[PDB]
Amino acid sequence: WIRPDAPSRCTWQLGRPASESPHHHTAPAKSPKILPDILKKIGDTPMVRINKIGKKFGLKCELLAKCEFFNAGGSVKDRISLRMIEDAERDGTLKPGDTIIEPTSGNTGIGLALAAAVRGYRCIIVMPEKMSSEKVDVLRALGAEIVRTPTNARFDSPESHVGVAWRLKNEIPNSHILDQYRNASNPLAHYDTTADEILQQCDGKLDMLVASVGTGGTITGIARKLKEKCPGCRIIGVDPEGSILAEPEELNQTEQTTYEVEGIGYDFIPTVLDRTVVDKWFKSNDEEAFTFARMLIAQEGLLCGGSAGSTVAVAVKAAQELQEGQRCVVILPDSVRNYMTKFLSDRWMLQKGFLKKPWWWHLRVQELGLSAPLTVLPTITCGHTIEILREKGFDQAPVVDEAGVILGMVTLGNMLSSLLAGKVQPSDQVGKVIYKQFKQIRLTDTLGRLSHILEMDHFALVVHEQQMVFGVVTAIDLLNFVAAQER
Amino acid sequence: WIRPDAPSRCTWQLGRPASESPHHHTAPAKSPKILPDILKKIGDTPMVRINKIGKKFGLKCELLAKCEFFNAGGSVKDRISLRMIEDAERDGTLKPGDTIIEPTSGNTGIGLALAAAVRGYRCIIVMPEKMSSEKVDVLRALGAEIVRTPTNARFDSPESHVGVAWRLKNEIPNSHILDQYRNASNPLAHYDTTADEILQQCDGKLDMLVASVGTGGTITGIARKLKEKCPGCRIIGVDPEGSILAEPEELNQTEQTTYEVEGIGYDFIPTVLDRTVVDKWFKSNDEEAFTFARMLIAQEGLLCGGSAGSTVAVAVKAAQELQEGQRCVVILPDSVRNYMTKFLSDRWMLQKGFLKEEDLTEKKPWWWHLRVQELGLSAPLTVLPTITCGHTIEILREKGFDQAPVVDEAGVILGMVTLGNMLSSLLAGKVQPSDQVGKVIYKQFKQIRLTDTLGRLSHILEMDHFALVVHEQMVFGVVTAIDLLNFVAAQER
């Protein structure tokens, strides 16, 4: 076994010329008009000015986001996945149809699974239990095999994601662990490409770089290059509370060692992380990470993930010293796709304790002044439905059976349109026209609750615990109320 | 009210010089090094060669995918959202802080909500009930207000997405419906940009273009440009069963008018759709759409949506008429993000009948239907929750076990402890020998029955490390992925 935290034997030093590098460096390769496969859509990610969040928190400098979620697999890790595989192929390590096994928090796994799918490798991913089910869904669809490990397993225990990866490799002939924690291809991808894109996009002018840290390849690769090209650029590392990557060590004094944000922080120092090139660390927490991720979406239209939020949360503190004319770049590592049922969900945010209202929000449904609806039996014909709605002056009716079970809604307009198009005959029962989907809501529920319900259903049927329908309410009724009140 | 199917008053005809257009026309532009905002990340999408799928279905031509899911909002509609807003701003129609209301199947709503978030407009989306909750979650996060309409509401009834959009607008001052069904800004975005990109990318050489159809903006804009610049190019339109877009009308004969694929097909002919520039239509269905979308992911690594699947399902038939050296381009409209809990989920697919246990078990390994009991389980040592960390080390070592379920006096399973994690914890000073195991115990696990299959175990092991075998409450066994691997390897030796 080779431990993921063994001290690095890299003899790189700032001031040492590139000639002396024992490593293979891949230069930018002119992209053809037609990409031979999706793996060429990795790199050259956009750099986008942040327009509202910096100003809101009193930054004077320019704040720019390097948006790594536009890579083919949706994350920054697509760069290292591709580079680790290509170098291993060049080395003769990785032969056609071999098996790739990787311990990952998710994104390196997705990157590797995507390349494996394209290139024809068997791919086995080992991922802690805390990681999102959205990651599992994409991994499965890409044909990866998936093993999970307890989130709280110490990294050197047999059941850690690293321990289990090495134990699987030992049982599977022609398997390899490319090993993002030790493989130079990880930070070198960022040194050769990500860093050169940033310089190019900024015309070599950059005062601060803020990056969250997991393996440390991103911050290490970018920093080694920037210290060479742009030594005035301050390097700011972001580490979650619970992790021990940050220096000085006094920053890491808490009991808690778990957190909800995914992809950053560890219980060991990865070999590829060079902490000497980080000028200053900040600790982040889950609440600010998710607050800022939601802000990035809502104010900048940037559909990014949790650690992107961590990074920007730090950047608005760290770049406060910068002046107008100066420039801070942040790395946004992955996409909102990984977190659809996590921080993107208000219910989740509430459950986890991580979370303004219009004037009408706390009012109750009954204050709408509901009209008691006409109801019809499910045995009514399409023709008699038209006749009774028009005769009684209603445009719709709940269909309710003899036992009082609400079966759905019919409307005058849809019944007429269906008749006139020959979809139903006047003597048909209403089965082919009835709207079956609706949501019940109480007389005593809030209009806020109604508003939420109306994001999923057209019709809310008003009921009460104490068999009767008190009203049918749609979004137009709620608007009419709100508008009338304020006119 | 203006019906979204009124006959087009456009007098374009194939052969009329571009100098006769009365429209505003843009073109693809080089983008700046630093984007001023994310709305610049729209257009110039990749054209990617499809390497496995074409060959597998016998195609001789080159098959290329235009991947619109790389746009800022995740779809092709980001092009028309931006264009409709920019034109309405230049017009003087849309003023600072006005309200945008749009009837949408979801992607145009997302596009407009994204632009509205950036530029500061109130945005109200009106979306049929069938559209995914993933769309709702993105819309919500972008600050859009969301209203829904019955999926099988006829377009001309008051409760359709188009009818409800009109009724909302009438009650909200300073609101506008940009109206993708009638607004020239929709097909023009594709005529001016999408089509020109496709031609630049193909060096002006292609033989067939296959596109699925909803508003008709994509196919109409592309086809009008291609018919002018590449008149050999065959235009193939894809329409779901249940929709009336396709011609001849005989193709549209069907029992149902509902389907699960999102973003294509309608019960009316949108004003922006020019069907005269479509050479041939193919009817698609849900099963092939989702089969092909999953195949695009699994074989090409293209993280696309349902209608992308519809399009490729048709392309592998339509392009059979092409020979080696010809080229077919397909439009892939949106991303897998919208369908995470729909076609991406095997449970949803099974529930819907688009996946049948038969070919779900054809691809299955020999061990798949063996039972957990056939692993030959060892009775595990269990320990009480009052055991100390020190005594856990001792009893595991003494009795020869690497792990033990923690089980209270009443038989409740509290979790697992392991020798390795207990020792690492002790050596690192996280616990002391006399501590109880609360801080080291793994509380997460999944129960499985002796009579469950190894296929079921395999699924379980994609979510949990430990499966604890129980029966109707003694523990029969503890199983992990490594145990399953060892068993399969031993039987295959």
Ligand code: HEM
């Ligand atoms: C003048 C430039 C450089 C020199 C002279 C240098 C030198 C070395 C040497 C001697 C090794 C040890 C090989 C071995 O133990 O088998 C090594 C490993 C490594 N280098 Fe470099 N290196 C340079 C640049 C870089 C850069 C730019 C990066 C990353 C951005 C990097 C990352 C690594 C990593 C991750 C390893 C593996 C560490 C280990 O196994 O302990 N190096 N380097």
Ligand code: HEM
């Ligand atoms: C090249 C010569 C073209 C001419 C002479 C032409 C002409 C016209 C005219 C005169 C109208 C106004 C209808 C009215 O309100 O009276 C119109 C509307 C329109 N045009 Fe064009 N057009 C051209 C190209 C295009 C192209 C390339 C597209 C789409 C790619 C397009 C799509 C439309 C649409 C969607 C409308 C709105 C239709 C309506 O409201 O009924 N046109 N066009």
Ligand SMILES: *Cc1c(COP(=O)(O)O)cnc(C)c1O
């Ligand atoms: C990997 C990752 C990071 C950190 O990048 P390293 O190069 O591993 O330090 C941050 N966020 C997410 C979501 C990641 O996957």
Ligand SMILES: *Cc1c(COP(=O)(O)O)cnc(C)c1O
């Ligand atoms: C809009 C859309 C289509 C059809 O494009 P049109 O330009 O409206 O014909 C196909 N698929 C998806 C997912 C869409 O959003």
Ligand code: NA
């Ligand atoms: Na993590």
Ligand code: NA
């Ligand atoms: Na649809």
